């Protein structure tokens with residue numbers, strides 16, 4: 458298991474997300490679905506020139522899976538996925554130029570929801586999750602698991618769980634007071650409000 462530090466601005470962003478009083482936490486789902494849509498756009502794009510890219514799975518979709526027993530909400534997509542290097546590079550060790558000014562804007566009152574437009578919407582997961590596990594499989598690498606409970610670090614390890622074929626699964630281990638996100642009606646409402654016209658099918662599983 459390898460442990461990495463979050464880049465300083467990323468850690469600062471995570472703390473802002475966890476600490477700032479902001480009731481509109483439901484935006485986390487819109488942001489994770491947006492990332493899934495980008496990943497699906499990318500594999501679709503690559504397949505236009507190389508159909509064999511879809512050998513690991515032809516279906517391009519997003520599934521939302523609540524599990525009340527585990528207190529988890531999982532967002533699964535069959536997008537391009539991430540290699541180990543992609544996880545490290547994109548989920549914690551590098552901050553895009555402009556991140557410092559963006560956080561200064563948040564502090565002066567800009568809406569936390571702007572993290573999506575800026576390109577750091579994944580971290581919205583920490584509005585509702587005490588821990589996030591990201592399981593991913595890219596055609597060019599083996600299956601990996603990234604994980605973090607914030608606190609300034611994340612881990613990466615090869616994953617031995619159920620093979621995914623291709624894509625990414627974000628497992629949100631919900632905070633005790635955020636169980637509304639395991640309810641069918643609540644998830645349905647959020648998807649309709651914020652993600653109704655995504656260009657790939659979104660299936661909300663039930664229990």
Ligand SMILES: O=c1[nH]c2cc(CNS(=O)(=O)c3cccc4ccccc34)ccc2n1-c1cc(Cl)c(O)cc1O
Pocket residue numbers: 489492493495496497499534536537538539543547548579593624625627
């Ligand atoms: O697995 C992948 N591959 C993805 C490829 C892109 C392309 N855009 S990018 O800026 O080049 C970029 C490249 C690699 C990793 C990125 C991670 C986040 C945002 C942009 C990233 C977008 C999302 C991707 N995801 C993914 C990630 C999260 Cl966090 C999620 O919740 C669900 C997901 O499917």
